[PDB]
Amino acid sequence: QVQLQQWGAGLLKPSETLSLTCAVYRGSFSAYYWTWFRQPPGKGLEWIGEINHRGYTNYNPSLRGRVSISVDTSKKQFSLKLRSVNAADTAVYYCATLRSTSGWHDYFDYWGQGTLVTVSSASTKGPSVFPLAPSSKSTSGGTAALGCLVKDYFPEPVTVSWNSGALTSGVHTFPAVLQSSGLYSLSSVVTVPSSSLGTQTYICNVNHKPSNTKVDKKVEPKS
Amino acid sequence: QVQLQQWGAGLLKPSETLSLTCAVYRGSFSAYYWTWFRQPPGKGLEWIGEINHRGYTNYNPSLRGRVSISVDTSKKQFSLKLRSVNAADTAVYYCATLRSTSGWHDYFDYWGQGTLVTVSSASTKGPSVFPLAPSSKSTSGGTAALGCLVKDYFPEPVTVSWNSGALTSGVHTFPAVLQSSGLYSLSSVVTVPSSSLGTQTYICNVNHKPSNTKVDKKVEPK
Amino acid sequence: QVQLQQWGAGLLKPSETLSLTCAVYRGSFSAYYWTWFRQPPGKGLEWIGEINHRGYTNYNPSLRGRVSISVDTSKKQFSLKLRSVNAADTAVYYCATLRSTSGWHDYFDYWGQGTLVTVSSASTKGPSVFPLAPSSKSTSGGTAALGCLVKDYFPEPVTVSWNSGALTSGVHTFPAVLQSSGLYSLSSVVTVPSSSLGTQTYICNVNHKPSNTKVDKKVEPK
Amino acid sequence: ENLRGFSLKLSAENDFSSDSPERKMLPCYSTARIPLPNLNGNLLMWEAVTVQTEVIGITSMLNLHAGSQKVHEHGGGKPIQGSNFHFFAVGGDPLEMQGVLMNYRTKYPDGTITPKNPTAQSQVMNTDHKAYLDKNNAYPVECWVPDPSRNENTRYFGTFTGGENVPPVLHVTNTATTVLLDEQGVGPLCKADSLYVSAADICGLFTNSSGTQQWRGLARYFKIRLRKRSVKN
Amino acid sequence: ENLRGFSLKLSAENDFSSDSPERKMLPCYSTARIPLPNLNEDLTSGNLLMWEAVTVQTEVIGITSMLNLHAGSQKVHEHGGGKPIQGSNFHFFAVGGDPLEMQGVLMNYRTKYPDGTITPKNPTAQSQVMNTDHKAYLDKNNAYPVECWVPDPSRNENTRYFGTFTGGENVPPVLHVTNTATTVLLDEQGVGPLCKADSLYVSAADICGLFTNSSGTQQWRGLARYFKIRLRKRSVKNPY
Amino acid sequence: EIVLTQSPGTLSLSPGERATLSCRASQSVSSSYLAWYQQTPGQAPRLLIYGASSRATGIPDRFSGSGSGTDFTLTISRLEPEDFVVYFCLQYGSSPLTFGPGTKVDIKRTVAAPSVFIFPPSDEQLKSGTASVVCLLNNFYPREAKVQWKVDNALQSGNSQESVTEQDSKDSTYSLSSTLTLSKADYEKHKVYACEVTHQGLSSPVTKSFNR
Amino acid sequence: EIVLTQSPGTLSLSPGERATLSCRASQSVSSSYLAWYQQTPGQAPRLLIYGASSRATGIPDRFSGSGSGTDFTLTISRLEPEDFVVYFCLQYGSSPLTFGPGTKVDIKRTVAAPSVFIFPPSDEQLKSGTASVVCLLNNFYPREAKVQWKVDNALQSGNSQESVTEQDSKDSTYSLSSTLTLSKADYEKHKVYACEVTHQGLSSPVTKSFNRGE
Ligand SMILES: [Cl-]
Ligand SMILES: [Cl-]
Ligand SMILES: [Cl-]
DSSP states (O other): OOEEEEEOOOEEOTTOOEEEEEEEEESOGGGBOEEEEEEOTTSOOEEEEEEOTTOOEEEOGGGTTOEEEEEETTTTEEEEEEOSOOGGGOEEEEEEEEEBTTOTTSEEEEEOOOEEEEEOSOOOBOOEEEEEOOOGGGEETTEEEEEEEEEEEBSSOOEEEEGGGTBOTTEEEOOOEEOTTSOEEEEEEEEEEGGGBTTBOOEEEEEEGGGTEEEEEEOOOOO | OOEEEEEEOSEEOTTOOEEEEEEEESSOGGGBOEEEEEEOTTSOOEEEEEEOTTOOEEEOGGGTTTEEEEEETTTTEEEEEEOSOOGGGOEEEEEEEEEBTTOTTSEEEEEOOOEEEEEOOOOOBOOEEEEEOOOGGGEETTEEEEEEEEEEEBSSOOEEEEGGGTBOTTEEEOOOEEOTTSOEEEEEEEEEETTHHHHOOOEEEEEEGGGTEEEEEEOOOO | OOEEEEEOOOEEOTTOOEEEEEEEEESOGGGBOEEEEEEOTTSOOEEEEEEOTTOOEEEOGGGTTOEEEEEETTTTEEEEEEOSOOGGGOEEEEEEEEEBTTOTTSEEEEEOOOEEEEEOSOOOBOOEEEEEOOOGGGEETTEEEEEEEEEEEBSSOOEEEEGGGTBOTTEEEOOOEEOTTSOEEEEEEEEEETTHHHHSOOEEEEEEGGGTEEEEEEOOOO | OOOTTBOOOOOOOOOTTSOOOOGGGSOBOEEEEEEOOOOOOOEEEEEEEEEEEEEEOGGGGGOOSBSBOBSSTTOOBOOOBSOEEEEEEEESSOOEEEEOOSOTTOOOOTTOOOOSSOOGGGGSOOTTOEEEOOSTTTSBGGGEEEOTTSOTTEEEEEEEEOSTTOOOEEEEESSOOEEOOOTTSOOOBOGGGEEEEEEEEEEEEEEBTTSOEEEEEOEEEEEEEEEEEEEOO | OOOTTBOOOOOOOBOTTSOOOOGGGSOBOEEEEEEOOOOOSOSOSSEEEEEEEEEEEEEEEOGGGGGOOSSSBOBSSTTOOBOOSBSOEEEEEEEESSOOEEEEOOSOTTOOOOTTOOOOSSOOGGGGSOOTTOEEEOOSTTTSBGGGEEEOTTSOTTEEEEEEEEOOTTOOOOOOOOSSOOEEOOOTTSOOOBOGGGEEEEEEEEEEEEEEBTTSOEEEEEOEEEEEEEEEEEEEEOOO | OOOEEEEOSEEEEOTTSOEEEEEEESSOOGGGOEEEEEEOTTSOOEEEEETTTEEOTTOOTTEEEEEETTEEEEEESSOOGGGOSEEEEEEOSSSSOEEOOOEEEEEOOOOBOOEEEEEOOOHHHHHHTEEEEEEEEEEEBSSOOEEEEEETTEEOOSSEEEEEOOOOTTTOOEEEEEEEEEEHHHHHTOSEEEEEEEOTTSSSOEEEEEEO | OOOEEEEOSEEEEOTTSOEEEEEEESSOOGGGOEEEEEEOTTSOOEEEEETTTEEOTTOOTTEEEEEETTEEEEEESSOOGGGOSEEEEEEOSSSSOEEOOOEEEEEOOOOBOOEEEEEOOOHHHHHHTEEEEEEEEEEEBSSOOEEEEEETTEEOOSSEEEEEOOOOTTTOOEEEEEEEEEEHHHHHTOOEEEEEEEOTTOSSOEEEEEESOO
């Protein structure tokens, strides 16, 4: 029942300092080695470093002396500081313990929720939501295809639902692509019965939390 | 996992009585001798005295008469009182335990975070930030020195960064000096390539939280 | 680790009922005999009575059947009621336990902080502060005496300091005397070098909390 | 490979219907065949007369600094304690065993030899579950007991002490001997000039700083005195 | 220098990979060589005389000192007396005509033992079970840690040894004293330890349990062991 | 640092079949300190195996690890639908700790041709001064498909972007979006917009196209 | 009280080398009640050794103590980067408890002469009625350096303050700032402002100077 709660600022410009904190909400703080990992988008994981309750640290040489890990035994918290951040530090950062202070034989699997850290000179921008309208060129037998193009937002993530989460069958929300502009873009598409067009209303619900953007775009058949 | 939490007024005026409290968490209040130490700026440590849960005290003769230590068993707190403070009482004060009630054989290393105690009549004052401008007299073998003089602030501390923390390489922020005025002065310098003086902008970011003073001073060549 | 917290109204008029409560904040309420004592000003102690958790009481005959002690096991509290109070009931009242329910062999020393109970027809009144000025009649061989007469206040206590607590050497603050009026008076004196009388300022700082009276009286040579 | 003499940490609270213990979590009986000198008017067999035996390294449990959970704040490490089993056998044939299970539905892993085609009756007495202790590190202690209905040519001795906080109590002396002769004054007769020694010495549970528990076992020494016995056939 | 008969306070929860115990935290086996009177008029006679150990009377000395519950022991509860010494204990003695022969076994083969201790050399994972490389003579007092070494039942032909380990957090010490109890040292052949070079070897470890300070820190408490050994003159063939 | 390689990159099997995943190390992994992790999209890694062969708390018995030194295997004895995700090996025998690049396990399915749909840019986007033309390849298997943009029969080169969904949980198919991005000016210079789709499930390459 | 002396004042050694630190008492310390503390800048003291030779809970085994009576030694068997800080002895055999004045352990590197830079007052400061002149001695080793202010070749005294950085984590050097403070009036009465630097890394004293209104 050991519980890790993760927080800290995810959005950074190059040269700034990443600061993350992990709280140990249940379980003995003194009984485990506390570890930081990161996972760049669509890649494997990298070990950053670790600490025990007495503050003894070991770091990955890959981070080039930019990394510091600390403990606060009074708050049962441990922290990551990564200096001089660049685009390649973009990743989900995780706090964890892989083993107790007894050693590697006593192996564990407690992870924080993770924090998306984006490093980019780009500024926060909400998406433009354009309809992908069902027509003769997007319909096939008893099936009509429609969607929303969620274009030119920063940073990740955006959440998309259809009819406030009531429409999940046939929904495909594509992974975001990073454009030359430094802005993200994706489509969300859905296939529905062609007979339901005009009778049933189809609304994509787009939420971009970093820019406080909420858009509810009605997708109607093309003229 | 004994936790010592230290509080009390750190800024005192001459002649006043210093009052500090140490709260014990995550440990038995009755099981340890509770001790006070102080460390004057850039000096060694002095033992002030100690108390147990029954209120038995021993004091250093070096400040005897002026010093009182007390316990509150209901709050699991112990306190230091130091009467008639002057500039020489300026120090980091630490609460601690060095041993259990079993005796000196059962030796411990629990310390409070410490209280910076400054004894001065001086008023809270933000700094003047003056440029240390790079010139022919501040260049040496392809490297130019520039900085900021952070003058006449009270109390400590002031923090300095360069280009909003983006320039850390070659940066030296000196320890503050106490002037005859009772105000502090600090210099922050950085060495850079002499060729970069025309191309690159250099700004020292000075923060003095006690006066809510934030200065961003552009340091340009003379 | 038994902790006794004492409260109740201290200031009473003759014929009224004294009502005090003691709370047992740590320790077993059922494991001890709970006792009330009082100490008149400048006198020894008197045993009032005691109770156990089942409400069995024993009282001092000296209180003339005016005394009641009760227990509240739900609140872990015990209470004193003294009916028909007169001037002779003026005392510090203490709650305590001297032994466990196992008996007198299992003897203890747990006391409340105490409550000052004043019984008087007098009403709350702040003092007049008169200087005791240093003179030819208050000077002897390089030592001068000066002071403040803190006259006609009710009830106790008053506190006196000199130069805002900076002057403590040579200070004598006398115990209060109860006058025929039913009002208190005390003097605070200090002896100083005769050479200091022209140069140095002497202010007595009188605080009478019950009347919210604060006086800072400058005492100058006559 | 670093924690020789320890089990994998104990799982807890598996459903009886979904109980799949990890191979390295299951202590097994130890056994060895000791080859004897070849002897062959009358044919000769080695007869086991006495055994001197003790558990080796009992003082290693006075290490309370390595990896054991503190008993309380500022305290030393928790001693090894809890359920223990101390068993040895000496025979002229492999030890004969009877299967009994806590849970007949336990799915035992590859590398273990456990009761085959178990039923509900396998939780009490099922006479189908007969085995020879014929492989080292294969027969889990929790599945098998020495069979008192067989072992005519083996002497066995075991004590089980169960419980959360059971203290290990272990004696060493080179002055104690166990006689292996039966009522007729005949000890185990070593068929094919082979002596069989078998043991299980689960000392208790080691507790890591996390509260995870591992079985600790120790080696057993055997010194067996043998004599030449004249036999027919 | 004030806490003779106690260990340094016990560390806890060291990583198996980083386990470096303090020398003063580790109880060691006690041993003494007792010189015996020369029996031999000369060393040329066909038969010579050797001292033979026949019986030992032995007990732990000062067991009643554990009835001091006022000096430095953690209160059992609020208002209570001090906590008795209790927890894991080891009571061991040996009598021989040679030094006690020992076998090494470790809780943790990777333990880094400190200067001034003699511990298993070139330990491997096998050292946590039985590694027959770890053979020592108890040939130095205050050197061989109890946690590293046990009497070797595969040797000690000329020594008789007796040990009981009782492990557990709260194990009560149980110790008997009597001047009426005797242990016979004679083997199956009716021969006791033969005292080579007119030397008798006595060895002991008497860890009584853990003492608990008001802080909760624990220290091993040990007590002296008394030996009274009855010896007889045994005729032997002159080996020279 | 120790480098771990995982084989295959993608493993295609049916539910109920045995999966064998390989982790190979550039040097011997001390004490067989090799862990296997499962990752479902949007979640932290989930430990299956530690110490090469030790099954973690609560992990089903269908997961087993074997091997030592440089060569390690994760075996999933009978694949359940939830098992068709990513698996990483981790060595912790040497500092720094290093992971392999991961293996994806996909459901082997019958060949499914894509439904190809084309969407012209919306009027609202055209007003903003940009033209996004979207070609949807919906519910196809296997993953291998080629999309080629032609504007008035002129092949496009470096103004299109592709995004592909993970294998669908219901029908075990893939979907693919191809987006042609042009200025309003460049969009209005041409009439015929076509995406040409090639796939194993299609008889010939399919062109979906519109005028304007 | 018992007086403790520590030797040397500064110990200059390389990472990986053996450090031997001395604590001597004015009289015999009862029961060898002598503790060793480490202090990193900005932190409370950290116990290494108590009772002359007992290693404290969680302290690495490279730390050991020995001695009795009046003579005590801390040994750091193999210096790690974090060990190059201050060490205090504490006697608790006699009331009052007394500390030694401390030993600094610094990273021994090759001798490095300071780069010397001089800064005139800013125009904005001079207008306000004060002249601060700053001499920077940058990236030198060892720490021992002498700065002398000369105004029109007259040696200054009483009107300068000095500040020194901790040993740099990257290059193991020190830097020093010296600030000469005069009134605007006194500043404008003179022409030549010079700081003269003496250091082991220089063959002769180095002067950096300016003429007022350059
Ligand atoms: Cl079977
Ligand atoms: Cl050895
Ligand atoms: Cl699963």
